[PDB]
Amino acid sequence: VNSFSGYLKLTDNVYIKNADIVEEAKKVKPTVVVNAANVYLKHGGGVAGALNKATNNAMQVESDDYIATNGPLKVGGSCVLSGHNLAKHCLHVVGPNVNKGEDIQLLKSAYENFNQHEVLLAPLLSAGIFGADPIHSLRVCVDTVRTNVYLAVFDKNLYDKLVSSFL
């Protein structure tokens, strides 16, 4: 039993809700919140900009030190950093950005990072400003993640479409 509330169950291990991931993290304080990161950990907009804003820019300060030490992530890769006031940990995961020409096949590799964590609160990778089809992202999530994932979808119209079209 966990504290996630109001989710629709899609499969044995995947759950979904129309919710602002920032507000959801603040309420649940999950062990892991997933950020929709880029390779530079520049949290300017989309989910990343919103999560970082909620940390009062502490996420960005920590991220800049991480990059200065380690260099950029790989597309499809991840790193674990602090969750600040939102969660114990933040798993920064880089899905391919279609608006940069990146290989959509890398979306499966991106979701594989979730399997290193027993339970996660997450957005749909490569959705939103990353330009991928969210219906496809949900399909890859369900077919790749084996651990327990609670998906927050900000847009109500999109949430209803994802549920209604789910096979």
Judged by the rule CB under 6 A, the positions of this chain that interact with ligand A1BJ0 are: 20-22, 36, 46-47, 50, 123-124, 127-128, 152-155, 158
Pick between residue 68 and residue 95 the one whose CB is nearest to ligand A1BJ0.
95
Q: How wide is the angle at C-alpha 79 spanned by C-alphas 78 and 83, nearest 5°?
A: 120
Closest contact distance (angstroms) between CB of 22 and ligand A1BJ0 is 5
Q: How far is the CB of 80 from ligand A1BJ0 (least distance, A)?
A: 19
Helix, strand, coil shares of the chain, percent, nearest 5, are: 40, 20, 40
Closest CA relative to residue 50, chosen from 67, 33, 66, 65: 33
* Helices within the chain (DSSP H only): 21-28, 46-54, 58-70, 106-112, 134-144, 156-164
Of 7 and 70, nearer to ligand A1BJ0 (C-beta) is: 7
Backbone angles phi, psi at 44, to 5 degrees: -90, -35
The least CB distance from residue 129 to ligand A1BJ0, in Å, is 7
Which residue, 81 or 124, has its beta carbon nearer to ligand A1BJ0?
Answer: 124
Residue 163 and residue 20: Cα distance in Å, rounded?
17
Closest residue to ligand A1BJ0: CB criterion: 128
Cβ closer to ligand A1BJ0: 67 or 158? 158
